């Protein structure tokens, strides 16, 4: 009985400390009770810090955090102290601005110290909870309940008189900022890092995940809920709309803007370069850029959604029986091989297809579908576009959406370039030491802001694309490409997905800058497609089909971007690329040749030797070879697997898939890749009234491709009946007959 005795004495001591911090001053008679500090209360703040140090850190326990959380130290002690300090300092600043050296604080240093210690406890207690492997069983047991207590913390921070603690935190930051750059000690810049970390804790708190034990078999009741919410906390309090509202009301956005825009001239950038990027990522991990531009209007889209629902409901009730359930109708169908098969239904009486769909659906044997089990959640990472569903939408309001649009616009127009340059300065030396979290957030920050500036420049001509021009430096090229390559070779798949998104948006930015101006563009397209990266982008779709839907959609968008940026050089032929030479490329140099090159391009001979070596590995690639390398059967397998989810996707992704199917089936002219039966079943499902809408623009090119596909199919089967077997099975590899199977000789 040592464990529960230690737990109850620890809870008793935290209860005594929480009573010893302060009181609401019920002795004074004010209609709101003003919070009064207790006697010897700064020592209590140091005791909470000492308890969180000695127990929570080295001993690998989280009992102190819940012992604090159940006694409401953050809710009832730290926040009233910080808000009282904020209100008193604001009133004193007003009275000192009107008349200086009148009505001072009695003990301002004490109040500043206890405010700083309260902010330290806010950062230390709202830290993001990650539970990796080999951790203690106490943390594994306590993780979900501590995530719920952190959700209560985020709601209480954002909701207490619209978040005056954010104003307290920025006041603690401008205590540092008012000091000159030369007179600032590193402790003051560490206080600035504390404030930026507090804002990243406020943004970064998200609802937890529901973990189940799979040792026992799942019963017949199954999962009834996956809700992981505290009682008073709803999904609206946690959501980003309240974050944007509380940040705009308390001028957090102007604080972040004025530290981002003067990061190099005013602040020591190495202290706050990483928490600033973490803050930007924690805004932009769950925001889609297409939904931020909306292009009675809510009722307009509502009326269109009810028309779509009415058409789908009509197509559903076509299959629904007109009579009741007990009105028994039995139908015996025969094949031309004489047999009797019985189905039970009323709608299935008249049409053959509903009856055959009944006969397919009456079976109770289901094949195994193996699952990856979503191992991304095992790593310590937030929910983002790599984890959310493709159909997930963030529902910004008018004012919150306008404030977020203004903040992101001023961020890009002020200091996206300086922040990106500072981060790619820092990470290019810390590349081999960063864990997956910084790689994922760097690639997502880069890709999100590049995509948002691309979309803003496409929508409006007032914005300049050169505001993300520092995305196009060689250092960011090297960093993104090396991150993607190191993610692939170590078989890390989250960073591979983030780098795939970043490379797709990098190619989109290069294509936009090339279409704008027709130069350094040939240099950078030679730089990205150098080394073995064409083979990397070629074999990324071959391994796509095993992983999740978002990985496969990124494979779609990356391969579409690769083929679009490489089809621009089909006639221009400018495809000189640094390649990796394998066997001996040694050449006996000639110093006369070296000196005449020195006269030619005005070079020193050491870097001319470098140029002479680098000219030997230069090769040229064929775009037809790039297409024919992309036409492997697992690429078609993963694209057919992506087209299976055609209900969830929008028009753009299936437009990309059918554009690549036009590339396979019309241009490249080998057609046996698409002569498989899963595509035929999927095309029947898409062209049915239950599938794609007739008013949607997707069904037009789906129908056109299916018409041309069945025309070539009937041509191939009329010329050769043996392909009646070939639709069932994967294509054949024997060289004596495989040419006739693939091309028809």
């Amino acid at each position: 009985n040592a464990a529960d005795f230690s737990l109850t004495v620890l809870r008793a001591r935290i209860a005594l400390l929480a009573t010893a911090i302060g009181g609401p001053d019920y002795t004074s008679q004010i209609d709101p009770p003003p919070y009064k500090l207790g006697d010897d209360c700064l020592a209590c703040l140091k005791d909470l810090k000492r308890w969180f140090k000695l127990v929570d850190d080295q001993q690998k326990r989280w009992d102190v955090a819940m012992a604090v959380a159940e006694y409401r130290i953050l809710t009832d002690d730290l926040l009233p102290i910080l808000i009282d300090w904020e209100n008193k300092c604001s009133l004193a600043a007003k009275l000192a601005k009107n008349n200086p050296d009148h009505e001072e604080f009695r003990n301002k240093a004490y109040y500043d110290k206890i405010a700083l210690n309260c902010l330290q406890l806010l950062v230390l207690m709202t830290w993001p909870l990650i539970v990796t492997e080999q951790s203690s069983s106490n943390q594994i047991t306590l993780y979900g309940e501590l995530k719920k207590h952190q959700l209560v913390y985020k709601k209480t921070i954002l909701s207490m008189e619209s978040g005056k603690v954010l104003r307290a935190a920025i006041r603690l930051a401008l205590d540092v900022i008012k000091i000159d750059r030369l007179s600032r000690t590193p402790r003051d810049n560490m206080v600035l890092k504390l404030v930026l970390n507090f804002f990243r804790n406020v943004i970064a708190i998200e609802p937890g995940e529901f973990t189940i034990n799979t040792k026992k078999s799942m019963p017949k009741k199954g999962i009834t809920s996956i809700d992981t919410l505290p009682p008073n906390v709803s999904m609206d309090d946690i959501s980003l709309n309240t974050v944007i509202s509380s940040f705009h009301k308390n001028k957090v956005f102007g604080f972040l803007l004025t530290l981002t825009s003067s990061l190099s001239k005013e602040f020591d950038q190495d202290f706050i370069n990483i928490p600033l990027l973490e803050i930007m990522f924690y805004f932009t991990k769950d925001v889609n850029q297409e939904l931020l531009f909306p292009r009675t209007s809510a009722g307009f889209e509502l009326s269109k959604l009810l028309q779509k629902e009415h058409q789908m409901r009509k197509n559903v009730i076509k299959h629904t029986s007109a009579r009741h359930s007990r009105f028994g109708g039995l139908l015996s169908i025969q094949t031309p091989d004489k047999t009797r098969l019985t189905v039970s239904g009323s709608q299935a009486l008249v049409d053959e297809k509903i009856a055959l769909q009944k006969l397919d659906d009456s079976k109770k044997w289901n094949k195994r579908i193996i699952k990856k089990h979503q191992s991304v959640a095992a790593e310590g990472l937030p929910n983002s576009l790599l984890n959310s569903q493709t159909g997930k939408a963030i529902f910004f309001t008018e004012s919150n959406g306008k404030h977020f649009k203004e903040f992101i616009n001023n961020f890009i127009d002020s200091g996206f370039n300086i922040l990106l340059h500072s981060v790619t300065n820092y990470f290019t030396t810390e590349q081999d030491r960063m864990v997956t979290l910084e790689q994922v957030e760097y690639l997502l920050f880069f890709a999100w802001f590049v995509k948002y500036q691309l979309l803003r420049s496409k929508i409006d001509n007032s914005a300049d694309i050169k505001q993300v021009s520092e995305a196009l430096k060689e250092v960011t090229f090297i960093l993104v490409s090396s991150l993607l390559r190191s993610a692939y070779d170590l078989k890390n798949w989250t960073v591979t997905h983030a780098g795939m998104i970043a490379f797709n948006e990098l190619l989109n930015l290069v294509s936009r800058t090339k279409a704008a101006q027709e130069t350094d563009i040939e240099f950078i397209v030679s730089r990205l497609f150098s080394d073995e990266r064409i083979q990397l982008l070629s074999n990324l779709p071959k391994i796509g089909s095993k992983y999740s839907l978002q990985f496969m959609k990124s494979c779609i968008e990356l391969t579409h971007s690769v083929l679009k940026v490489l089809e621009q050089y089909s006639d221009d032929k400018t495809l000189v690329i640094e390649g990796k030479s394998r066997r001996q490329k040694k050449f006996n140099i000639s110093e006369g040749d070296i000196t005449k090159l020195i006269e030619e391009e005005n070079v020193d001979r050491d870097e001319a030797l470098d140029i002479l070596t680098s000219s030997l590995r230069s090769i040229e690639v064929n775009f037809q070879k790039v297409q024919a390398n992309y036409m492997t059967e697992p690429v078609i397998e993963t694209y057919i697997n992506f087209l299976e989810r055609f209900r969830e996707l929008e028009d753009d992704s299936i437009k990309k898939v059918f554009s690549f199917f036009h590339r396979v089936f019309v241009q490249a002219k080998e057609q046996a890749l698409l002569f498989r039966f899963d595509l035929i079943i999927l095309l029947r499902e898409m062209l049915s009234p239950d599938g794609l809408d007739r008013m949607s623009r997707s069904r037009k090119y789906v129908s056109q491709f299916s018409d041309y596909f069945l025309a070539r199919l009937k041509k191939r089967l009329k010329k050769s009946p043996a392909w009646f077997v070939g639709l069932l099975f994967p294509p054949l590899h024997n060289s004596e007959v495989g040419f006739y199977q693939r091309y028809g000789e």
């Binding site: 594994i140 040792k215 509502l302």
Partner: protein, 317 residues
């Protein structure tokens, strides 16, 4: 031990619901149609929200004619056709408007502070239905019924939001929702624990609501020749309990619902209990399920002291 993680971000959203939410919250914050004094921008629902903020209420009275005037009747038709689908979105829009305007109104209102259970009442429907006119094709729809209450039930507590504790590792699962039967969670959220049954209810932590079941029949004016009167059960919850007394001509506006046989769903401690219904369910096993037509009324009117000077002059016009 082996554990599988389930995320809340994987859940498919039904975008028509949040567009209904946007339309409803814009209807609240932008109605502004009143003829009091001169023709002015009034926003009477915002004034009603400040009326709650003054007087500490929890229910809203919304006229359906206002919904028909706002957005060509389309929003009113979307609410009336599928009320049951959009009711969480209606509550979310009301919570967003209250958060925008009256931030202290979200709490119950002193250490105990719970989320306020806002109840939405839609009155003044264009038509009224009889009990004889009730069909099962229009369940989950906004209907108004005139009738006479025979008897009323005790004001009893429903288990609205439930919290349970695991008996093995004392893990807490809260916000379990009971639709029609008392349900317990299945999977313990602690990945180390493998508990499936034996969950203990937390009476204090769980949130309860008032319940009343009033039984109504059609009025003697609409009773035809030689017929026994047909009956209907009407559920009053929240503020509307004890509003309707038995024997009064009264109009209930609200939701037509269908209730299953609770004993056939396998309730704990109850043996399974004549018309043949539906079957083939896992919770049913081999048993069948029967259904009854009931009503979930959100607003009630009835169409069938203070002996001091100061309170009488305060109550006077």
């Amino acid at each position: 031990f082996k554990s599988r993680a389930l995320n809340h971000v994987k859940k498919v959203d039904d975008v028509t619901g949040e567009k209904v939410r946007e339309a409803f919250e814009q209807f609240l914050e932008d109605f502004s149609v009143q003829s009091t004094d001169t023709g002015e921008v009034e926003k009477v629902y915002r004034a009603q929200i400040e009326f709650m903020k003054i007087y500490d209420l929890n229910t809203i009275y919304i006229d359906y004619q206002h919904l028909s005037m706002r957005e060509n009747g389309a929003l009113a038709m979307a609410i009336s056709e599928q009320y049951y689908r959009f009711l969480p979105f209606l509550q979310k829009g009301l919570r967003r408007v209250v958060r925008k305007y009256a931030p202290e109104l979200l709490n119950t209102s002193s250490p105990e502070q719970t989320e306020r259970v806002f109840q939405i009442s839609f009155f003044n429907l264009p038509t009224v239905h009889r009990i004889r006119d009730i069909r099962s094709e229009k369940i989950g729809s906004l209907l108004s019924i005139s009738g006479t209450v025979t008897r009323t039930s005790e004001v009893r507590p429903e288990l609205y939001k439930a919290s349970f504790t695991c008996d093995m590792c004392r893990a807490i699962v809260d916000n379990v929702e009971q639709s029609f039967k008392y349900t317990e969670p299945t999977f313990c959220p602690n990945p180390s624990c493998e508990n499936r049954a034996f969950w203990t209810l937390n009476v204090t932590r769980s949130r309860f609501l008032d319940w009343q079941k009033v039984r109504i029949q059609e009025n003697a004016n609409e009773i035809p020749t030689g017929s026994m009167p047909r009956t209907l059960d009407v559920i009053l919850r929240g503020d509307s309990v004890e509003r309707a007394k038995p024997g009064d001509r009264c109009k209930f506006t609200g939701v037509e619902i269908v209730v299953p046989d609770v004993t056939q769903l396998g309730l704990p401690g109850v043996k399974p209990s004549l018309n043949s219904g539906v079957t083939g369910l896992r919770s049913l096993g081999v048993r069948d399920l029967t259904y009854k037509i009931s009503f979930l009324a959100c607003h009630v009117i009835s169409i069938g002291n203070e002996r001091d000077q100061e309170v009488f002059l305060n109550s006077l016009s």
